[PDB]
Amino acid sequence: TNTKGKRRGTRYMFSRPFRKHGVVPLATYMRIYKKGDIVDIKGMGTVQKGMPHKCYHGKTGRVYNVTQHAVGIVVNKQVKGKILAKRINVRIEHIKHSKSRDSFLKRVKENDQKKKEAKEKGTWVQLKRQPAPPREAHFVRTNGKEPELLEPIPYEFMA
Amino acid sequence: GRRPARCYRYCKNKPYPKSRFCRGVPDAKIRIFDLGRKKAKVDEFPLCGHMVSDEYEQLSSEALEAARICANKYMVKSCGKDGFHIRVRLHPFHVIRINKMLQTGMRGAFGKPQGTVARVHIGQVIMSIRTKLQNKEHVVEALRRAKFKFPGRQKIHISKKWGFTKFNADEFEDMVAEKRLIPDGCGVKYIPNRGPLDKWRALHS
Amino acid sequence: FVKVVKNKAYFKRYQVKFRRRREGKTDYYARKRLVIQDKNKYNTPKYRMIVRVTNRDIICQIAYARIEGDMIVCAAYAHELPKYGVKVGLTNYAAAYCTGLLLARRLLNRFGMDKIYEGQVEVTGDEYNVESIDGQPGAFTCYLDAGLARTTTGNKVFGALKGAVDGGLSIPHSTKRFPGYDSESKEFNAEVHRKHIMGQNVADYMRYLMEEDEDAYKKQFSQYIKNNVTPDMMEEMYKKAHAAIRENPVYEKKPKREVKKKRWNRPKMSLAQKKDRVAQKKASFLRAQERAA
Amino acid sequence: KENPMRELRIRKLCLNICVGESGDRLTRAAKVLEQLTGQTPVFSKARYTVRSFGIRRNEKIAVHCTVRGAKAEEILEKGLKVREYELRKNNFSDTGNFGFGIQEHIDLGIKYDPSIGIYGLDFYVVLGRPGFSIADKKRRTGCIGAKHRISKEEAMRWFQQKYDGIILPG
RNA sequence: CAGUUUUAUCCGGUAAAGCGAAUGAUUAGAGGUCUUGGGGCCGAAACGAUCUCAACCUAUUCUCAAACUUUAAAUGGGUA
RNA sequence: GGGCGGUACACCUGUCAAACGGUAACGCAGGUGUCCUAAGGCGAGCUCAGGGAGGACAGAAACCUCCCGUGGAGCAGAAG
RNA sequence: GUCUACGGCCAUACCACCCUGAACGCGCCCGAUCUCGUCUGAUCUCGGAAGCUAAGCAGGGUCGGGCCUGGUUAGUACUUGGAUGGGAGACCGCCUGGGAAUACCGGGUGCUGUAGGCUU
Ligand SMILES: [Mg+2]
Ligand SMILES: [Mg+2]
Ligand SMILES: [Mg+2]
Ligand SMILES: [Mg+2]
Ligand SMILES: [Mg+2]
Ligand SMILES: [Mg+2]
Ligand SMILES: [Mg+2]
Ligand SMILES: [Mg+2]
Ligand SMILES: [Mg+2]
Numbered sequence A: 001t002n003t004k005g006k007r008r009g010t011r012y013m014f015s016r017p018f019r020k021h022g023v024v025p026l027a028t029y030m031r032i033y034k035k036g037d038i039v040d041i042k043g044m045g046t047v048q049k050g051m052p053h054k055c056y057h058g059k060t061g062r063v064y065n066v067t068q069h070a071v072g073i074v075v076n077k078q079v080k081g082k083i084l085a086k087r088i089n090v091r092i093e094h095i096k097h098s099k100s101r102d103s104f105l106k107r108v109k110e111n112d113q114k115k116k117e118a119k120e121k122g123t124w125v126q127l128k129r130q131p132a133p134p135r136e137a138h139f140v141r142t143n144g145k146e147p148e149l150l151e152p153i154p155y156e157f158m159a
Numbered sequence B: 001g002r003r004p005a006r007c008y009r010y011c012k013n014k015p016y017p018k019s020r021f022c023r024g025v026p027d028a029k030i031r032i033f034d035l036g037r038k039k040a041k042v043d044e045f046p047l048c049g050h051m052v053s054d055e056y057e058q059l060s061s062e063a064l065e066a067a068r069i070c071a072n073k074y075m076v077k078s079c080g081k082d083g084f085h086i087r088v089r090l091h092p093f094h095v096i097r098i099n100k101m102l103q104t105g106m107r108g109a110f111g112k113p114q115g116t117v118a119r120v121h122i123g124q125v126i127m128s129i130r131t132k133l134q135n136k137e138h139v140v141e142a143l144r145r146a147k148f149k150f151p152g153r154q155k156i157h158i159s160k161k162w163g164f165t166k167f168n169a170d171e172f173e174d175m176v177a178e179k180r181l182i183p184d185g186c187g188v189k190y191i192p193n194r195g196p197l198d199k200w201r202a203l204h205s
Numbered sequence C: 001f002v003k004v005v006k007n008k009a010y011f012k013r014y015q016v017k018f019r020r021r022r023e024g025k026t027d028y029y030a031r032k033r034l035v036i037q038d039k040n041k042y043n044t045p046k047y048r049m050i051v052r053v054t055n056r057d058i059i060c061q062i063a064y065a066r067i068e069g070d071m072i073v074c075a076a077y078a079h080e081l082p083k084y085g086v087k088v089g090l091t092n093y094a095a096a097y098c099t100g101l102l103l104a105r106r107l108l109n110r111f112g113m114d115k116i117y118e119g120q121v122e123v124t125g126d127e128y129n130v131e132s133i134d135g136q137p138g139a140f141t142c143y144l145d146a147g148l149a150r151t152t153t154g155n156k157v158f159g160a161l162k163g164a165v166d167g168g169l170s171i172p173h174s175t176k177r178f179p180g181y182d183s184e185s186k187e188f189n190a191e192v193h194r195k196h197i198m199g200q201n202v203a204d205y206m207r208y209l210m211e212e213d214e215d216a217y218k219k220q221f222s223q224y225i226k227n228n229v230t231p232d233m234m235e236e237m238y239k240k241a242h243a244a245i246r247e248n249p250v251y252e253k254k255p256k257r258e259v260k261k262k263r264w265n266r267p268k269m270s271l272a273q274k275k276d277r278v279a280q281k282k283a284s285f286l287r288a289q290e291r292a293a
Numbered sequence D: 001k002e003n004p005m006r007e008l009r010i011r012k013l014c015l016n017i018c019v020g021e022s023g024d025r026l027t028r029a030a031k032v033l034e035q036l037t038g039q040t041p042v043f044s045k046a047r048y049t050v051r052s053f054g055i056r057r058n059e060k061i062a063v064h065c066t067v068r069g070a071k072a073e074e075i076l077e078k079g080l081k082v083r084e085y086e087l088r089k090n091n092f093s094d095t096g097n098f099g100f101g102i103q104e105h106i107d108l109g110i111k112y113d114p115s116i117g118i119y120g121l122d123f124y125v126v127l128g129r130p131g132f133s134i135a136d137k138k139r140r141t142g143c144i145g146a147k148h149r150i151s152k153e154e155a156m157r158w159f160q161q162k163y164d165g166i167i168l169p170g
Numbered sequence E: 001c002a003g004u005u006u007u008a009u010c011c012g013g014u015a016a017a018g019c020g021a022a023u024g025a026u027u028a029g030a031g032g033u034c035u036u037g038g039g040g041c042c043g044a045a046a047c048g049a050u051c052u053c054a055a056c057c058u059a060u061u062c063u064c065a066a067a068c069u070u071u072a073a074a075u076g077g078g079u080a
Numbered sequence F: 001g002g003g004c005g006g007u008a009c010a011c012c013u014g015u016c017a018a019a020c021g022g023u024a025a026c027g028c029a030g031g032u033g034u035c036c037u038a039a040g041g042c043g044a045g046c047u048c049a050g051g052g053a054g055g056a057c058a059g060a061a062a063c064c065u066c067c068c069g070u071g072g073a074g075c076a077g078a079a080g
Numbered sequence G: 001g002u003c004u005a006c007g008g009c010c011a012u013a014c015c016a017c018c019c020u021g022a023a024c025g026c027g028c029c030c031g032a033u034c035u036c037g038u039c040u041g042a043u044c045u046c047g048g049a050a051g052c053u054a055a056g057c058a059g060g061g062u063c064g065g066g067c068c069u070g071g072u073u074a075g076u077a078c079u080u081g082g083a084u085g086g087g088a089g090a091c092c093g094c095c096u097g098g099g100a101a102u103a104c105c106g107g108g109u110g111c112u113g114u115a116g117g118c119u120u
Helices: A102-116 B068-077 B139-146 B171-177 B198-204 C093-111 C157-167 C191-197 C238-242 C271-287 D024-029 D032-036 D069-082 D132-136 D152-162
Strands: A038-041 A060-066 A070-079 A082-091 A095-097 B034-036 B047-053 B057-060 B084-088 B094-098 B112-120 B125-131 B154-158 B181-184 B187-190 C048-054 C057-063 C072-077 C143-145 D009-017 D042-045 D060-067 D098-100 D122-128
Touching: A038 A070, B034 B068, B047 B139, B068 B084, B068 B125, B068 B139, B125 B139, B139 B154, B171 B181, B198 C271, C048 C157, C057 C093, C057 C157, C072 C093, C093 C157, C093 C191, C093 C238, D009 D032, D009 D069, D024 D060, D060 D069, D069 D122
Parallel strands: C048 C143
Antiparallel strands: A038 A060, A038 A095, A060 A070, A070 A082, B034 B084, B047 B125, B047 B154, B057 B112, B084 B125, B094 B112, B181 B187, C048 C057, C057 C072, D009 D060, D009 D122, D042 D060, D098 D122
């Protein structure tokens, strides 16, 4: 019968990385966070005010609220079978952006660039991502010499 | 004695070292881990015969006492009294447990410390003898006997090194000769081409 | 025979601090309060007002902050005074108030709020917290950022404060550390402050140094007397700072004659020369070795 | 040329009297320094209580003072006047400072008074070169540089150059 | 919509490994001045000289770790 | 098995936990039913343990002074 | 090339010993009437400007430590899935696919995304 504390089993988790102790650098704060952006959550042991509970360290959600020093956020969780949609209020230190949406926002623009162009040309340019196909037949030139014969080594006791 | 060693033979539990937590530990019997004329140079004991273990097991330190003695008494006879150097290359740190059934019974049966033991992997050195090159046919005979104290099965192997080093056989004299290695009693130090220059001048001059 | 404490195992476990703290010019615990904007403001910048004291110079700059390093809008040096006619005692409290005025109406002459929001024309010494004007574009504010100078009671920084405020900037302050504050009964005079502004405490040396001795009047007044400045010329300039020479606030940065682009710093000795030096030193040590003995 | 910012002057001169007892012994040993310099001294106190000496934690014991400028040369002349200019080798620290303690304050020229007694005290001289208050100012600290730092031999041929003080081996 | 996979992305401190790196445990020699002692020892004295056993400093060496860690996999966990 | 003996009968800290989270036994090593007008709330100013070299009685250890000094100190209690 | 305020994890930027430093600059330096403080005008605060290159300064140097990246160690250690595969058991081989880390040997030692005054 283990305990039900706030910070059970977080010896290594809220700890600072090696040789990165000390002062929180000042480009963590003055970044801007709108509503609708997608955010991952990483804990931190310096500023004890406004920590998340230990079961959110790694999850990723979106914003619904902005406060004076915090943003509200909507995440998902799995409790004994079902999935709950719960919302918290997290200070800024414990929070980063997620770059997962960005290669999509670079491919919406690239596709609409590849569509506005060459539609008036009557061209049919491929739009779907297609998985890595099986590779093509190709020649191999051995100019001159022969392949190098291998030999399995005879055993000797190394130790 | 105590309970025989059929009981505590297979590596089963997690390691339970003597520490801040496990006090109440009696001391091991083995206290000296090498013998002979250990005040040696690395230039007069070329030979180096190991005893490689084979099976994943536990070796008691009373075996690490009654093997050292049985290899010493034959080494004094054959090779002389100053013609060798014996090392024992284990140290018993693991601590094994016991339960006394003396009416309470089986409840609360966490054990008390009984003795000490040493873990052994496969292909791991236990004992090692370095000697002159003329005396090779009496170390197979000493270790053939030391094999009757340990359980299991292990093999006797003559190395391809020089002494208690990590260097090869022939390579050693051409490197000492070109002044890359320095003798330090039982060992040798390696000189790289990396450090600053004043040691170089303090080596050549 | 003691243990060397700067081992390899001292340099492995040694996280360095920040560069501006190693060069000790700054404070990050005093910045973090001053510089961040509240997150419900959404890219609304936070103006701060830097004041720097150097042993021969005064600097007054204005800057907000970004992630690319905090960015200047309007600078005001204290050696652009001898344009106007103050050449000596370049760093006293008087020029600390004259610079904050040159900054103030410089910025108002870069935004277009000159005639509106005048500020104080006379020099009195009392509180002139400038209130905003209805209908017109609102007032301007900027918070102070002194830094590493103990703001006790009587600092030259506050003279620049009173200058930019009376120029028209709206800076929050309270008259408790100004020259003229009674630390036993807590009242405040104006004329003691105006006796400290125009240069009368500087002037009084035209007695305590002009009478009692005459040898030290030349040991430490050797640039007033060279520029022919008497101790009664403690005089107004501010109509010259006011009128029209902020149409060159920047002095019109001067054009640049083409430079020869010559170098004054010996370049880095390369690899294939550091691999060659120790072959010289090993052959010189062996040809000065085997010859001798 | 000797780069006139390479002189050898006195930064400060220290003084203390440790009596190991509060009450009246301390407050009477506080009038020798006041007559001696002209300024008030500062009481020191204990650090951790020892059962054998007879001291308690944070109990006042000693009295010390610091002297500057042209005042230190005068008291130091009454010092080397007392010691007749025969200091020795091992009085000099490895960083460039010396010090020594007189046995009785009658040698400083102070007349005896029978409600005081005699209190033994200590001197300690601290040398200097221009730039030494770099390592203490608040704004831009920096350090010295170690071409500009004082050894033991330079100080001994300053003492021998200045006061003609001999140094004997021992 | 999915008890699944791919392409982008962040999270984690387990197996292994490592003490010539910290926190703890541990074997044997090598050079130094004594850094201090208990005794030889010549000594009206010594770090003079000492055999040193010994601890002390520096480079090396033999083995270890659930409540120790620089590094750090496999499977696996959210998002789009 | 009951009994005598214990509290795993409400709480927290490391470990078992098998690299998110969750997870048992009369499994381990440990603690609590309080204390404080400051040991709470702001602001200025300072930097610790240990170590060296010195200094009158002063010694293993009183105080002073100089240098090295990434936490080896401290933060009321158990441990992170 | 410098001064002001910075950015990023803040070391490719640190530490130790050397050396050259043009002009503008930064600084040690000259001092104590001015309600700034101290036992002490050293530190802090103010009023200054005769005089000069040590300076956390700036730049280069060390067959340097340190750090940052690359090979070796190694398809080794480990490992998801499976077998009427051995073996008395301990544990080890195979198919299937993933796959590390030290020692050791090499190269690098501040970019300045930065705005204002400035080798100009
Ligand atoms: Mg078990
Ligand atoms: Mg320097
Ligand atoms: Mg030099
Ligand atoms: Mg382990
Ligand atoms: Mg798991
Ligand atoms: Mg407390
Ligand atoms: Mg530059
Ligand atoms: Mg020219
Ligand atoms: Mg290096």
